[PDB]
Design an enzyme around this catalytic site. Structure first.
Site, PDB file in Angstrom:
ATOM      1  CB  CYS A  95     -13.521 -23.559   1.787  1.00  0.00           C
ATOM      2  SG  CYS A  95     -13.567 -24.527   3.174  1.00  0.00           S
ATOM      3  CG  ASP A 138       0.262 -31.793   0.083  1.00  0.00           C
ATOM      4  OD1 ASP A 138       1.598 -31.006  -0.362  1.00  0.00           O
ATOM      5  OD2 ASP A 138      -0.415 -32.040  -0.940  1.00  0.00           O
TER       6      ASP A 138
END
Ligand SMILES: Nc1nc(N[C@H]2C[C@@H]3CC[C@H]2C3)sc1C(=O)c1ccccc1[N+](=O)[O-]
Lengths: 311, 252
Positions: A95, A138
């Site tokens: 990405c 997270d």
């Protein structure tokens, strides 16, 4: 030597750059030698691993293989490297952007309709993983990627874990400090999806403020900063908060504000946005907005309606 | 691939082990043996039957790629169980698996000086084999646990504790004694065990009010001709296995 048809050697990829530039660990950009396809390579850290192939690695791999969805990062495969004394790489689809570095960059500008899409995708992603009995643990801008065709992906399932419902005894040092929820700071060990939704709030806000909103230094100094925004931690405001061991840390048993809305009005224009943010950054985890009701909030169903990405 | 780890009878015959001169006979024996070692160690290690079952499935799949002549059952099984227990979250310390593997395989011999080369090696040997297990399986470790499917589908035929227990038994032994897990989906197998448990218990599941048989409500591919071929096959190896059938036999 040994037959090994389902685990190709990582040398099929050409390394290119330490993409973490420190901040992700030993994580590389890389290019598939035949196709051009760009990927992320994570080496499975093996330093101080006395108990064979790390359990935390196994866990992440189990989770990634399960989670298959447009808004969750894609584990392509797992790769070896031929021994003589050998290593294992997780191979993700590459990405091009992440939301931390996009907010950081001043030349990048976010229209309202875009910001709606970003959040829409993020909460959709959260709906999915929680629906699959999994906590991310997270949430932070840095772990939210976006593809060059403007598709957001949740990434870093390194401290992710499966959940369900004797009390649940879950690890407490989880989530980065600035995105960590109340419950976890007051020492909660039976929590669930609300911890991620808390994070989504700090991120949501960050989409206008261009910088994390609550930058603490310690558990107490963080929980202070939170109390200076969402009210203070009253059993009036959060039924049964008294019951927590770590209650009356430096927690000003008096000194409360009221609202998130006030300190953010300045940056967040849209009236509907502020409201979503407020139901996300709620003190009581069991009264915090969920992935489902959040996606249905009038923010995602009013003008400017949500739109695809270039900036 | 969703059908990577499923094989035809044709495929099973041409296993990596046949390829190095191992009779079909001998191979299914080596399989049965690694299951027993796994169940034995698992019990002494106090791991769940599930963890043992996961370890057996790894073992069965492992040996569709590797030959028994290159990796012996006694080597693989502790490594495979070591891993299974980590995967299923009942992790057992590596030392501990090595001790329990030893006393299982060499009951009379002594536990080596846990400072020797002989030991520090057979510790590295395991970790090495675990790595090889992982790569042979291509890190695909989520197993479709065959007990849930049996428990699901005993209650869908309103069975007694007795017929339930008998079915669970058949299912567990089908793992050790057959290569069904490598040919038939966990639901099909479940139907097989329930079917046999009925034959053994002289129980009959009533034909449904729709005119259809109970097993169509689990999996649409399940035919009476198949179930009879498989429950026969299972029962034959159960008859071959000493004292197995005694455990569920009606003495009264
Ligand atoms: N699949 C992908 N693509 C990336 N691209 C990075 C390059 C640029 C900097 C951060 C983004 C944009 S990071 C990335 C991971 O998912 C990733 C893979 C392994 C370890 C950690 C991460 N992680 O924390 O994102």
């Amino acid at each position: 030597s040994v037959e090994c048809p389902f685990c190709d050697e990582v040398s099929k990829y050409e390394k290119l750059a330490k993409i973490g530039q420190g901040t992700f660990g030993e994580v590389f950009k890389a290019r598939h030698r035949k196709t051009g396809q760009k990927v992320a390579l994570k080496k499975v850290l093996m330093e101080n691993e006395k108990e064979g192939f790390p359990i935390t690695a196994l866990r992440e791999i189990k989770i990634l293989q399960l989670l298959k969805h447009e808004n969750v990062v894609n584990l392509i495969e797992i790769c070896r490297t031929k021994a003589s004394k050998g290593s294992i790489y997780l191979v993700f689809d590459f990405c091009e952007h992440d939301l931390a570095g996009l907010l950081s960059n001043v030349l990048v500008k976010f229209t309202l309709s875009e910001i709606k899409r970003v959040m829409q995708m993020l909460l959709n992603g959260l709906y999915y993983i929680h629906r699959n009995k999994i906590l991310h643990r997270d949430m932070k801008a840095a772990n939210v990627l976006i593809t060059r065709d403007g598709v957001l992906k949740l990434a870093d399932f390194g401290l992710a874990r499966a959940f369900s419902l004797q009390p649940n005894r879950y690890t407490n040092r989880v989530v980065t400090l600035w995105y960590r929820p109340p419950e976890l700071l007051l020492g909660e060990r039976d929590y669930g999806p609300p911890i991620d939704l808390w994070g989504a709030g700090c991120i949501m806000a960050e989409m206008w403020t261009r910088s994390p909103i609550m930058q603490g230094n310690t558990e107490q100094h963080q929980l202070a900063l939170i109390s200076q925004l969402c009210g203070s931690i009253t059993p009036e405001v959060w039924p049964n908060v008294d019951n927590y061991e770590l209650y009356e840390k430096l927690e000003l048993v008096k000194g409360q504000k009221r609202k998130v809305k006030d300190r953010l009005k300045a940056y967040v224009r849209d009236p509907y946005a502020l409201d979503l943010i407020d139901k996300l950054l709620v003190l009581d985890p069991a009264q915090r907005i969920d992935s489902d009701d959040a996606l249905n909030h009038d923010f995602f169903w009013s003008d400017p309606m949500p739109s695809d990405l270039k900036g | 691939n969703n059908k990577r780890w499923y094989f035809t009878r044709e495929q099973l015959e041409n296993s990596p082990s046949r390829r190095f001169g191992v009779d079909p006979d001998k191979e299914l024996s080596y399989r049965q043996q690694a299951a027993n070692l796994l169940q034995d160690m698992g019990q002494r290690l106090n791991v769940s039957q599930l963890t043992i079952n996961t370890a057996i499935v790894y073992m069965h799949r492992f040996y569709m790629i590797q030959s028994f002549t290159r990796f012996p059952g006694n080597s693989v099984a502790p490594a495979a169980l070591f891993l299974a227990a980590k995967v299923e979250g009942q992790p057992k310390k590596l030392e501990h698996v090595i001790k329990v593997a030893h006393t299982c395989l060499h009951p009379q011999e002594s536990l080596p000086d846990t400072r020797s080369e002989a030991y520090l090696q057979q510790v590295q040997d395991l970790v090495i084999l675990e790595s090889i297990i992982l790569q042979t399986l291509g890190f695909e470790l989520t197993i479709d646990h065959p007990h849930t499917h049996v428990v699901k589908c005993t209650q869908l035929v309103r069975a007694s504790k007795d017929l339930a227990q008998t079915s669970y038994f058949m299912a567990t032994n089908s793992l050790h004694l057959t290569t069904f897990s490598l040919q038939y989906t966990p639901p099909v197998v479940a139907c097989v065990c329930i079917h046999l448990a009925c034959k053994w218990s002289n129980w009959e599941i009533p034909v449904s009010t729709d005119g259809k048989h109970w097993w169509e409500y689990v999996d649409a591919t399940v035919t009476l001709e198949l179930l009879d071929e498989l429950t026969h096959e299972l029962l034959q190896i159960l008859e071959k296995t000493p004292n197995r059938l005694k455990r569920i036999w009606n003495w009264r």
